[PDB]
Amino acid sequence: MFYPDPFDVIIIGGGHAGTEAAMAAARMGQQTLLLTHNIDTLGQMSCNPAIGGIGKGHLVKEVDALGGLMAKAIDQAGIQFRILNASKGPAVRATRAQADRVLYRQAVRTALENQPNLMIFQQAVEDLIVENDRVVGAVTQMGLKFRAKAVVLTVGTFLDGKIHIGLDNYSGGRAGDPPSIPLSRRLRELPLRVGRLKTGTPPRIDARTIDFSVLAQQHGDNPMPVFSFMGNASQHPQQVPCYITHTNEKTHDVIRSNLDRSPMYAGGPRYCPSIEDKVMRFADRNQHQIFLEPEGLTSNEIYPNGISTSLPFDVQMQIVRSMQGMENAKIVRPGYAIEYDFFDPRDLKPTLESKFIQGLFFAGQINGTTGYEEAAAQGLLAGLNAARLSADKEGWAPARSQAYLGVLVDDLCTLGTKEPYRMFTSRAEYRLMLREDNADLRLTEIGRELGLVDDERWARFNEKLENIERERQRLKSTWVTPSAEAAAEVNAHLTAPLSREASGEDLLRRPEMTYEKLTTLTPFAPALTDEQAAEQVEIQVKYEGYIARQQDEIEKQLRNENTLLPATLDYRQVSGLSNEVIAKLNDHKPASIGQASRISGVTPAAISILLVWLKKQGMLRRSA
Amino acid sequence: MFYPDPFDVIIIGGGHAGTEAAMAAARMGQQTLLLTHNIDTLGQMSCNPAIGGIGKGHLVKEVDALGGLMAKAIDQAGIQFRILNASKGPAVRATRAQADRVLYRQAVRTALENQPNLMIFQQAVEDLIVENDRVVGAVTQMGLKFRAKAVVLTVGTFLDGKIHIGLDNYSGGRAGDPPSIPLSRRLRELPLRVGRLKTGTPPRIDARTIDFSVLAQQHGDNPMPVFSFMGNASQHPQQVPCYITHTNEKTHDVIQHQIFLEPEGLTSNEIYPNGISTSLPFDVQMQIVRSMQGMENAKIVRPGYAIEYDFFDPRDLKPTLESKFIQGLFFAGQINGTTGYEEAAAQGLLAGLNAARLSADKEGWAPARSQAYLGVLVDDLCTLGTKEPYRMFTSRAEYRLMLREDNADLRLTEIGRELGLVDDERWARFNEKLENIERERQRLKSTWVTPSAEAAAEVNAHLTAPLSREASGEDLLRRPEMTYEKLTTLTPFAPALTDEQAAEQVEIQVKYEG
Amino acid sequence: MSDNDTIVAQATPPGRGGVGILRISGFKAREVAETVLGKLPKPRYADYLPFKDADGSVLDQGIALWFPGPNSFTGEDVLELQGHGGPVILDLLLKRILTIPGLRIARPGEFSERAFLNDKLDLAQAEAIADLIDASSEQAARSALNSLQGAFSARVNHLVEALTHLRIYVEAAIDFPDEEIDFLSDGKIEAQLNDVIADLDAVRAEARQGSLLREGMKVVIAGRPNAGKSSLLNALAGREAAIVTDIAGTTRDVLREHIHIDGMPLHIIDTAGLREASDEVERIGIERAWQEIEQADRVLFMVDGTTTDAVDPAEIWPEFIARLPAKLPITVVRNKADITGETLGMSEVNGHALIRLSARTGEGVDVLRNHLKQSMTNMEGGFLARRRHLQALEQAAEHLQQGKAQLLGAWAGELLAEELRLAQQNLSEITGEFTSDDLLGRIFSSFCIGK
Amino acid sequence: MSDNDTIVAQATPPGRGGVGILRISGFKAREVAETVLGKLPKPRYADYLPFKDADGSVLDQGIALWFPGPNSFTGEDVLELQGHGGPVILDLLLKRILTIPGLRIARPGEFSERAFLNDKLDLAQAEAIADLIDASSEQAARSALNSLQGAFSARVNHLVEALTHLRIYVEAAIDFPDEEIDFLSDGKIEAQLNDVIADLDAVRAEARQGSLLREGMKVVIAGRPNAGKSSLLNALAGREAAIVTDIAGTTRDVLREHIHIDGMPLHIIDTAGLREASDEVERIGIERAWQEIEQADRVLFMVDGTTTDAVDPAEIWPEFIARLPAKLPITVVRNKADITGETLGMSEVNGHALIRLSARTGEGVDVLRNHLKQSMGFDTNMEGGFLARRRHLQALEQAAEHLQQGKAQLLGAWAGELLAEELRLAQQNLSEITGEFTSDDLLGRIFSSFCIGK
């Protein structure tokens, strides 16, 4: 029964967050166990075979800067690379890759198979062990049970999932995988609140039945970019294009005619995920964009992006066979939806620990989210905190001002909506400083403090920081005058010629000028070879004022950030707060006064009364 | 509720029999559909990653001679090749290889996915459409049903199976693969025979916990042998050695036998202990694995287990592998009480051939015991009706000198061209080989020498019973000490045919004319 | 908005008086003292000097007391200014104060907070400090619904909606540059910006004309027709306001009159007699009076002595009592006592005053006045309530000004989104909260983004 | 009241607040200080100390100021006790203070009274104290404060001194009748009188500009029932001032609203549609409306453009033109001009302004506001100025009458004694606002109107 070795942390389910959690915990020098459903599925993409995007590449870059694997498994499994918002400001750009699938799976498995201090095991889990609000040990299916000082669940979408097509259903975690039924009941009994969600995916076409001779093409990019702050472009395999097509009125006619056969309509997020929703919500539009993308460079399956639905198979076939270039097409994998359980993130601390149980952590889909990049960060943070706890040290959690992960966690704790949580750039209030290129500049050091970064990254970061500081100082050490001997060209190709003492630092303050242009000049000598470091000086110079404003704004909320609120607080024992606000706070149970202030329905009067009450009970050392 | 288009032949289950059946049916020139659980598990080996050997090597050669798939994939998924009993005569010679699972699976998937006339659909089936004792299409799990003219069943070990571990078990086709429970229930209506069998696998140790400095290595033969008659040695991947470790008395106590630690991939960290299989619990398995040299402190990644399944004995199908009870439905694969991969690939190929013939409205062909090892296997199984799973051995083929694994092409590829299983490049190479062997044989028989020859001195020196009368090249070669290379290396008997295969064939024919 | 902000607030109650108090407690207390007085007088000394302005004119003359911390009410840099209790002059002085950068107006009962957490106030009265804040906040919220109540609360809705539309079309093509939405990213964006600015001016010019605020505490007198409503209002006003006759429903339009009582302003509202209306005018007037009733502060339900001797307001008109808001204090007036002869005086009925008076002659008039003043009215009456709106709208035009100037350079949309978000954040102090999720919801509902 | 009797009064407005300040002055202040404080703090020192009850129990805590005279608001010993804006406690403290014999709640204006009784400032500056503690517009408040600075007293004193010098010259001439005729005919006296007349006329014109913003003026909206006058007033108000509908006789009661077009006061008065109706209430309303027209400074006419194209006043309704007294400015506004489509703007018919506009749509309200602003004598050209009072205007009129009579007597009868008497009487009338000659009755009546405790 009981295994003869006690581990530090136990991860249950090696999906997209489980792998990150295991990697972080193991690299942080703690014996880690990884219990998984089945192997050879490590790194499987059950939906659109793409990585990155707007709001997702930021999370990927954070995971990389903290020492993750997501950004290193795509440099060797991606067949197309693009940069979104290339013409706009650097703070909003993104990188998106169409990724080969088998290469990604193999890379992830190989990376995770040779990790020191980490052990993997193939088994299911049918229960957990708890006594006195503590979680110690997990039970598998054969009978063997394990003991550990911390547990992390990353079940994803397998907690009693049901596959729906048309008006019929059958049990399934996904297309070809079994359901994790009993653990659903076992977690249900605990003092928790659980609900359900549903989402679908389209079919797969055969790439040798589509007449690509009359379809428009879409290519990648010249000098293609990279994801990790380590690799380069020599690691990418061969690239391939994408094929663009559209729909026509016949497809709309068929969809409307057969709309009766559907779980919805017949007898929901704020956008339109399916295609019948696309048509019904906006019935005047008579054209839609559809993408056909290869799932790899060794497979002849095509993923159609833009045509997800829930209609029966016949309507799927008719919709497929009513588009230019798809006159005679074959389907190898039908579309379908799945419904799965989830937990509301109002009973877990900001460190992704259940506020009620001790040692239990939550990450991935079960946190009411959706997307690959929304699970890797959660898994990384959960594993970091689990290792810190099992080692008997103080945990850690980022703030809304230093990582998109902080925004994600805070919103998932204090939102209360019902849509699956998707990350968007405008969804964060500190966009101007939470960029991509500077992710390491603001995170890697923390990892080195917690032992999440090895020596190669440390040396690279130290060299980059030295380059940045030297460039800043050197640019600060220049000066020009209107009568400068070489000032003729400077005034010629720069508007408003010099009228007094000048300087390159002040020279760049003009918006029209650039960095490389200023470098190409006798004064302001050749720029440094490592342009990755060079771009940082430009960004700093162009965003200094807004950065300073945001910084002094951030420093002022820190006292409310620090002021903590224990989960044992009973707001019914406070005088001067309305009934509705009391109910709201009792339901939410924030962690700090600021997080409560970010709730909707609580005004400054409530926080002032709460502060006065705190000072009366002595539950605060001071509030300054 | 019915697919818009019809089909000619339907194959159920893309296992080891299913891939061969679908490939044969598509090649012969019909429209076929392959129904499989998951596409990403096509070409999966659930046991020892080895192919060929004694008996299990002749079948692969015959399948390749009939234009198959397995040999051309093992040629690229094998990391160690050897010849067993290379000292003995060609009758009992054999070949073996160690397969990289990822490479073999990729090869199988890629080869099978680019076939004309073949369509693959991923939807677990649940029922068959039979009316008036005739087979027309079958229904799936999501409701949709197809219509076709012939069906081949290769369900395998997923029919009402349970996975056992230690002293407990749970239902399932395999470790992590659901079974097709409803499918078996539907077939029970017919008055048939039901049998059961159990199988298991050992654990999979972690390569990072074994000591590889106190163990004896084991390599393969240098001039790497090949399986396919149409291949070469430049297709083989990198070659790696195995390891030898010996048990201890404590193992028998807990329950000398040298054990092999077979690498389970060229880019993996698993190890396959060949000879530790059992149905013991995990504690017993750990204790046993901790009782061998160099494995004092090792961990198990994939715990072992044993499983049972259901099948119908191959006593109710015709020598063409077609259900006697039900027209248009054949039987082939694990569902016919057989194991291994070679034992099932040939059956799948034969079933696909017969199904395509019936669909096109022609006649099938059941191989003979005087011609094919696969025919011998099928005869021994069906005609006997035996419940015992046949295993291919060299012993059961009394016609050893003729039914070698060296001349499967000569006796089967020409026949295959008639049914259409053979292709043009093959046919051309085969005709060239046959012509070369015939020319060399006739030229050898048309040469004569007498003791008066100048080279007669060295001939007598190299030969017992020195020259006495008129002699010919073939008669001289018939001497037991004579060799083809020595015959070539002479003033007479001008340079021999550079085709090594033809030279070996002519040597065998001359020395075994009897 | 750290705990170190220097705030400006008024200590003396709203209304008429000979002295008004403005106190400042924060880091910038010395800054404000130097800005207004142009110098720093002797600490804790009743210095004397007038209030000058930037132009050099004098806004008021009074006594200033500068109290450096910690020996002060809040134990910090606290400035106290004493002048004349004039609402207009007080508003002018407060407007002068607020223009200084980094300053803001205090929230309801903030100084109690500051003087409490600095341990400059005793600790026993936590329960009382928990109410001195809630009552002030509730009264402040109740106010400003008169600030945004006329046509002025019709141009701000336009401004907010226009800004929301602009943000929908400016922020969509930074987050979904892969759909077909035909964004307005071209130069016409700036054109659509201009009108928004041109809209704001309208709002800023809407409150510069119209009524005159007329601070005070509201009062309502109503009842059935011919119940003495006209006579009571005329007697209270001291001059004829509405016709006095026996005709049912003599008055059909609401009337508002202003009266002061020993420095405590109150506003008298006259309404048509409550009853079933058989006329469009009568029904609409009944609706208007009813709506004015809920917004009222103090009410005196008409109780005619001739009609009946019932004293309980619930028994007299249970439906009217039920319709009334709970918090609304209610007073009972037994009209027509001079004919009924019921003794004059103040009496209580079920916790509510029952008063019998002779409206036709003026008997008992003093008693009602005595109760009215004795009834009390914390702060935030009018002039201060509308200062918050004119301030929030003030520090959003400059946001748009400094955001538009960006377009003249390289077209970077992130900075434009930042400035528009800041402007809408400052505007949210008037209408309501507009979170980052509401914009996404509107974008979803407006376009076919989907997936 | 009695100066010797020490007085106490509450200063801050009633209600609740941070500070409720009590102001006490008299000869008992020091004794009352000991009874409530048992100590006399350093004068002009913001001393934090408790307040003592008669029994010795701590009454309250706050800020207590002791201001010995004459360096105080009134020049006597005044104790400024500042506690908290708790009306409940303030009642107890005031009762305790009134308990001590020799203390009494001084009558309103006493604080301004005694400080006036000690010649701290000009008398009219006392009223200047009022009219600023309760104003209506920002411009009015600023002008009232500027007057409180004491500018008007400067002009009054300059005029009185000039009149005194002229009186001295006239008396010197009169004392010598032989050369008195020559002195009068020299021309210096006439020049002095003309310059004084000019300056007095300028000051009276500025005073007329003053008190203009105290109330502004009264405009009456007169027209037939359902002409839209209620709608026009509602548009001018900017709210839902009255009830608007198609029912005849939409309004009966006289409606008064106080607004400010642009930094100016004004009272727009609505009325019932002029028609003969059997309703007694409607007849009374018509009576009231006809009563108010005479009072109003200006009048406008609203007539539907579609009903009749007549623009001349007689054609529209010959009855109203005859009834209304002449000499009153009148304007005609064409309501519902959008249906007529008439060009919108300012027009004059029969020498009177004619305006077209639609109330419901709101078009033409801006031109109406501009006309109201410009027609009434006022503008932003002159700032600071001075704010006056009715009594000031009456005194100025009497002084001007006296000066004119004196000049006429000098020109016609050459009566030196009569001219001197007229000049002295005019000087006394002018000084009446300064309080040197004004009797105590006027001072008391003016001071009584002030709020209690001021």
Numbering used by the authors:
A (entry chain C): 1 to 267, 273 to 629
B (entry chain D): 1 to 255, 292 to 550
C (entry chain B): 1 to 376, 380 to 454
D (entry chain A): 1 to 454
Manuscript excerpt for this entry:
In contrast to all previously solved crystal structures that show MnmE as a symmetric homodimer in an “open” conformation with the G domains of each subunit facing but not contacting each other, the GppNHp-bound MnmE dimer (α2) within the α2β2 complex adopts a “closed” conformation, where the two G domains contact each other. The large conformational changes in the B subunit of MnmE in the α2β2 complex go hand in hand with a displacement of the swivel helix toward the entrance tunnel that leads to the MnmG-bound FAD. Interestingly, we also observe very clear density in the EM map corresponding to a bound FAD molecule in subunit C of the MnmG dimer, while no such density is present in subunit D. Closer inspection of the structure shows that MnmE binds with its α-helical domain on top of the deep FAD-binding pocket of MnmG, thereby partially closing off this pocket. Moreover, within the complex the side chain amino group of the C-terminal lysine residue (K454) of MnmE is located within interaction distance of the C(4)=O carbonyl group of the isoalloxazine moiety of FAD. Interestingly, the distance between the amine group of K454 and the reactive N5 atom of FAD is 5.8 Å, sufficient to allow the presence of a methylene group covalently attached to K454.
Within this complex, both proteins collaborate intensively to catalyze a tRNA modification reaction that involves glycine as a substrate in addition to three different cofactors, with FAD and NADH binding to MnmG and methylenetetrahydrofolate (5,10-CH2-THF) to MnmE. Within the MnmEG complex, MnmG is responsible for binding the cofactors FAD and NADH, and it is also the main driver for binding of the tRNA substrate.
